[PDB]
């Protein structure tokens, strides 16, 4: 022990630091949209504003950069706890020191306040570069699920050599409730791209290209219909429309397999259906075989009475009834073969149990 009590604390201090860096990284993204849609619908009149917003964005970025490094220091503090070691100079590798720098560069791109309705060329990219802050979601999702500290769960995940990572939790969530997450992501991706493209192809002279003209263009491109009444006209608007088509094709590729798997009989329904479809065939065969002798005897009576116009009329009903009997016989034999072959995976246990009981 000793190193087991200090692992339940340095890992809980990483659960309130990987979730509080998702609030200051959401507040920042929630202000660029406000600034853009206020500069568009406003202009140079609102000069007192459009400055406090940028100052708030800078403050939020500075408060996020002071949490990312704290989280990484806490993660470094776990290596020395796990592996018996005190000198911190060796617990720091040569790749983590570059991952930290990359994270700080990616999480530090904002339109700083260094000072009509158009954003520009530098701000229009420094704002759209704030959407890269979405890599913090899997970390917070993984650190919150209660499958990482449950001692009754790792004790079984270790006996089967199973490692707990993001993909395992993602697959578990997908298997629990598939349709909910699919619909949520599908309807949440049609509102972000519909603004990323609107900020790319908006114009003022024609008053066209805003959300009203993109919320219609994005879905028909996603579903690969493409009426062609509205089309992108800028080089930066022809790449989002190409990414959306690939996303739609991939979504269809995922959807087809799930749709195929969802509807199917299982063992219980199959066995019940097979058992209850046999009595109907057993009754139909008896009815068909009873519908043959009646005509075979009536024809004999009529040919002994020499009607010469009803014997030749009843000689067709016999020939049709024989065929009707044959069809039912073949269907019954096919169903019998299926039921005697479908139940062939559980009979092995019974056979080997009877053999073991015999012990001959």
């Amino acid at each position: 022990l000793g190193a087991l009590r200090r692992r339940k604390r340095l890992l809980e201090q990483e659960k309130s630091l990987a979730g509080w860096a998702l609030v200051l990284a959401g507040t920042g993204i929630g202000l660029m949209v406000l600034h853009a849609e206020m500069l568009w619908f406003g202009g140079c009149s609102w000069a007192l504003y459009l400055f406090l917003v940028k100052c708030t964005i800078s403050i939020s970025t500075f408060l996020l950069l002071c949490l990312i490094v704290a989280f990484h220091a806490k993660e470094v503090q776990l290596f020395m706890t796990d592996n018996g070691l005190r000198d911190w100079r060796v617990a720091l590798t040569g790749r983590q020191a570059a991952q930290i720098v990359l994270e700080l560069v990616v999480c530090g791109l904002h339109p700083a306040p260094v000072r009509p309705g158009f954003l520009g060329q530098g701000e229009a990219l420094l704002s759209l570069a704030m959407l890269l802050r979405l890599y913090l979601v899997p970390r917070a999702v993984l650190l919150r699920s209660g499958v990482l500290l449950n001692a009754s769960y790792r004790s079984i995940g270790a006996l089967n050599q199973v490692r707990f990572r993001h993909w395992f939790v993602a697959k578990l969530y997908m298997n629990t409730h598939p349709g909910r997450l699919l619909l949520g992501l599908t309807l949440g991706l049609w509102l972000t791209t519909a603004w990323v493209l609107s900020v790319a192809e908006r114009q003022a002279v024609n008053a066209t290209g805003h959300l009203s003209d993109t919320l219609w263009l994005i879905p028909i491109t996603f579903l690969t219909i493409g009426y062609g009444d509205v089309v992108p006209g800028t080089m930066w608007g022809k790449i989002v429309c190409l990414c959306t088509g690939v996303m739609g094709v991939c979504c269809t590729a995922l959807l087809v397999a799930v749709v195929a798997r969802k509807l199917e009989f299982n063992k219980a329904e199959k066995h019940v259906h097979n058992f209850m479809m046999d009595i109907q065939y057993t009754k139909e065969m008896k009815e068909s075989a009873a519908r043959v002798l009646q005509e075979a005897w009536m024809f004999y009576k009529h040919t002994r009475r020499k009607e010469s116009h009803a014997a030749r009329r009843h000689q067709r009903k016999l020939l049709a009834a024989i065929n009707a009997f044959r069809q039912v016989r073949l269907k019954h034999r096919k169903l019998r073969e299926q039921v005697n072959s479908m139940v062939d995976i559980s009979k092995m246990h019974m056979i080997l149990y009877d053999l073991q009981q015999n012990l001959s």
Binding site: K286, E287, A289
Partner: protein
């Protein structure tokens, strides 16, 4: 009455079952073919399918009595199998004779309703042994007229 080519083709077909050139089919040679086709028969049905066609009875099948079998399974529908098998549904106990109970049950209750007196008269007319037990011979004779 067949031509030379037909006889050669039927000999080639016989060679599938004969395997070794002894000239007859036994219960241990048809069973191998049936197992190769996926079925798993036993000796009882193996003998049942062989004594059906043996015109004299030796436990083996020869070419003259194989041509008789193959002159019936080549047509679109053989009218003898659905008379031999539309007879075992009238035979529930399995003794081999149609007693009054099975007939009076299946003919009247099921299918078109038939009068009991009419059923009795039909049974009496069909029966030729006089013992009140309709056999396969009388059944086939009545259905072939």
């Amino acid at each position: 009455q067949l031509t030379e080519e037909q006889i050669a083709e039927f000999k080639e077909a016989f060679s599938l079952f004969d395997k070794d050139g002894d000239g007859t089919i036994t219960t241990k040679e048809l069973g191998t073919v049936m197992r190769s086709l996926g079925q798993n028969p036993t000796e009882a049905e193996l003998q049942d399918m062989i004594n059906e066609v043996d015109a004299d009875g030796n436990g083996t099948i020869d070419f003259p009595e194989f041509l008789t079998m193959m002159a019936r399974k080549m047509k679109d529908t053989d009218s003898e199998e659905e008379i031999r098998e539309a007879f075992r549904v009238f035979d529930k106990d399995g003794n081999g004779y149609i007693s009054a109970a099975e007939l009076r049950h299946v003919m009247t209750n099921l299918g078109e309703k038939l009068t009991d007196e009419e059923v009795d008269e039909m049974i009496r007319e069909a029966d030729i042994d006089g013992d009140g037990q309709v056999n396969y011979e009388e059944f086939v004779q009545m259905m072939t007229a």
